[model samples]
Target: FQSMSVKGRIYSILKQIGSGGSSKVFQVLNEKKQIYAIKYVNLEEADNQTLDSYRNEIAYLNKLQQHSDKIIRLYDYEITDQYIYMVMECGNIDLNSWLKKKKSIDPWERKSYWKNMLEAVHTIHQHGIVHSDLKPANFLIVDGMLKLIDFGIAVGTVNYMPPEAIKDISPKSDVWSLGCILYYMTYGKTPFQQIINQISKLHAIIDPNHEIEFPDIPEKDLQDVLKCCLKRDPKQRISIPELLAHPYVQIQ
Candidate 1:
């Protein structure tokens, strides 16, 4: 596809950003000097489920148009005989990478990030979807804002999984993972890291009785929010609306 005009848009495919078993991402630019990310997938190499997910992603992106910009913006999509192309927004860096680059974060900034993540997640849930794979790497920081990225379905990721999602993930699974992320951010390790080796060593613990210890801070509201979000029983966990109304997030 070299030197080929993709729908009359000439982007030299400057560099490959990433690739999957059936797809590849590239950094591209137009003569107008604009930057964009392109996800091109080969249908021949993908299964029917993969193709359906691409379509579902496009549909979800369209549905979120009126919601919030924190969700990754999709400019357009094009489908061919054996390939599909998705044009997505570019970001400065992912949350995990950004965190490593900085020595530390302000207490207020940490609280703000948690709020922003919840708002975007609430928007996603409102659209009847689940970001089953929520993690630090999936959060992209663009222009001082956190834009949720890689809305891919949950697979075998075990670090942040909840009790009910032991075999399959649900919408509530995202909340459990969010709590894990917050725990990591606060204490530099997950709440279960001590006993839980990985998914391979799963089932050592995952219960309300299991202790979710806290850090050496005086943020009671933050502690409460994390406790509510990390409830072992999905039904007992705090819902998105309740999260937005929580005292911690309301801190100015």
Candidate 2:
């Protein structure tokens, strides 16, 4: 129940950066004077099953961090009666917020960003972990690099979820979420503004059998890469290494 102290050996909390139902993240300064993001979660507030899932996310990130620079670095973790705290490298800003400031990113820039994302994602999959929640907000830009963050809703998130989660909870559902992110990056708007109003629209837009569409971004090769990542059938979606082999990324 104690607030992190300013003189704490690990980090000095500077300000609140973000918060959601499961946890809150803070910007903190370490003993080395480097800024880091610290996420604190109350175990009591979450069910045992959910807590285990969070631990799995932590494990996955810990293992994947060694092989990928596109993921935020986890420095430390601890558990107490009140909370579980996870310390990670700080990032400049998330992709969604960054995109809003730019309105629409150039096709070349989008290609570069997605290339980095897929490289990181490929690393994760190599370790047998699936990033079920691949979206704009989960992506961060720092020092001219794109990094993926936030894995709370990732474990069970797949191509489909039960109707209950779709109706009442925020749709953190699977690789389909990647479709939303890709669509936004390509067109500068979310596929679904209101979840219920556009369920069918989402279904159609994400259908693998449907023909692919591209904005007038003038990058056909990059568009093809997006089409593969945003495929509707999770099983049929291209793996990260497979994506890296594409000419769009390989030539770069």
Candidate 3:
């Protein structure tokens, strides 16, 4: 983008970090020499409904900033006729890319990672906010700690949501996404394999009741934790504090 100071606040565009159909993220440096992430949204690309959703997301993040450490801090925001600009903290690679680089991680490593992830989720739940998106791509590892990001799709009253979320978008969607992430971490692949043959085999071989079958990892308690998180019935799913109290996390 052409550099132009808006309202006397000059943002030097450094490099493009990410791009999507409606949004683009840039790694930029402010006049103070501090690094920041700038997310640019094209107002024209989004209709009024979508634009309202974006506004809601910003409002929610601003409110959540009061209590949650897992969420990225919003530094500032600017709106113009053509676009909306949001300034946030810069973080390293997300969990998806990080996992792709490793063939396999030790069971202990898995435990540690999951612990951090669950903690972040707990923080969100405690704040009466549900993070609808909890997939690997939305999780960032900054300075060796797991931090949740991308609240563009997050919604709900917090505690938990109903089961209909599987077919449509809902707050409880995080539970499903968390399950998918845990499965990938333990098996080095998604529980539902993309390959038709492997997928069929997976369904046939997987024991729904046995948590260990879901992941190759040796920790039964940890596997159970994932199982509870993935429960199809939202009512049956474990709450944030309940998950923290589970043997796996409690013992640690």
Per-residue lDDT for 87-191 in model 1, tens only?
787777788787768766777877888887888888888877888777788888877888887566412546677777664456677888888878777776667
Ranking by TM-score: 1, 3, 2
lDDT for each residue of candidate 2 in 184-216, tens digit (9 for 90 to 100): 777766544424545564464555465545555
| Separate clash counts for every candidate | 0, 1, 0
Q: What's the CA error at residue 7 for candidate 3, in Å?
A: 5.6
Q: For each candidate in the order shown, give its overall lDDT on alpha carbons.
A: 0.76, 0.66, 0.68
Question: Candidate 2 regions off by >4 Å?
Answer: 1-10, 152-180, 190-196, 202-212, 230-237
TM-score leader: 1
Q: Considering every candidate listed, which one attains the maximal lDDT?
A: 1
Candidate 1 achieves a global lDDT of 0.76
| Residue 20 displacement (Å), model 3 | 0.9
TM-score: model 2 vs. ground truth: 0.78
TM-score of each: 0.88, 0.78, 0.79
